[PDB]
Symmetry: C2
Subunit: 194 residues, 2 copies
Amino acid sequence: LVTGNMNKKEEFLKMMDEELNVEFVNINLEEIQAQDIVEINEHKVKTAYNILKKQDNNKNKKRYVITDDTGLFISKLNNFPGPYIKWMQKALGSKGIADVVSRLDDNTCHAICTYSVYDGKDVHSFKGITNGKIVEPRGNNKFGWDNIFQPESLSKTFGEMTFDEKQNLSPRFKAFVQLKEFLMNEHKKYNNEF
Amino acid sequence: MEIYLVTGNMNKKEEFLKMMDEELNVEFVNINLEEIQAQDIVEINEHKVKTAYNILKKQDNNKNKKRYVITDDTGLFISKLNNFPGPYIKWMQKALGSKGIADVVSRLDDNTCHAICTYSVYDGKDVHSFKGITNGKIVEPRGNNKFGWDNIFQPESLSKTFGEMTFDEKQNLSPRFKAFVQLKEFLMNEHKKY
């Protein structure tokens, strides 16, 4: 039980990592309001760790628990909604967000994904940022706001990509890669000490 | 009986006292409270008052028969943002300010919205919440500007924003006054039992 990750909607970590084994737990986490996405996610990961601690596996050795969170920061909303994108997406949907942005002076934005890992004592966070533009929906529409996000100077949306091109621009991948190197440096450190 | 409104805002304190008109003795306590993320503002405020109650109760080393703790929370619900930001208004306000929100709303098909004030009271066993709701329009800032987004909320059919209006003009109109008179009736009812 050395590495625990939490979601029910997500099979990205599967394909993103192969050098380590990982477990997937589903907990119903209460998020808090704050200004910094990292603050929200570190609180969430500590909260989840504690729930995993008091329930069942209360007796064991070092355990790593991981949560993620994504924000969408829209330039002409002065970087709103950030970590509240999921309430905006619930209210407006991809089409509604794109129609709002088509009424602003420009459509530039950026998406941030953060991983946070907690071992009972230490918290670590890794964020990936990808600049882009809100555009009218294109591509798959079951992946949230992927269909309206057009990264960098490209002509596609995330909803129009699969995994070859998406990964390289995915803020989640940029973040994950930092998280993997930390986990592997902890696993390597563990093994040298035996 | 013992009633506590949670606030550190001196202006909010005096407005409450004046609403109460010496009908009930109300004490104030300045406690920072975390706001969870949730769909409904009442769910947010109810969690917040239950938290405020427990912080006060553990501190006091007391247990009273009846002790009433009250928190409030407000939201701005913009019609052409499909009622977003709602309870997240203050993160929009911090990002964009009053001028920025008015500017954004003026780019949508209309500037209609509604504002909601909520009071939640908790005695340790039962939680009760009260929702005051008022329709309006988002306009260029007008009046006092140190009261959050009052200066851009123009209650429906009127030509003044809340920032230009007096206490008497808000009676039966301000979402806070509507919620307060419900709360006060509940507290008065609880007082007959004492």
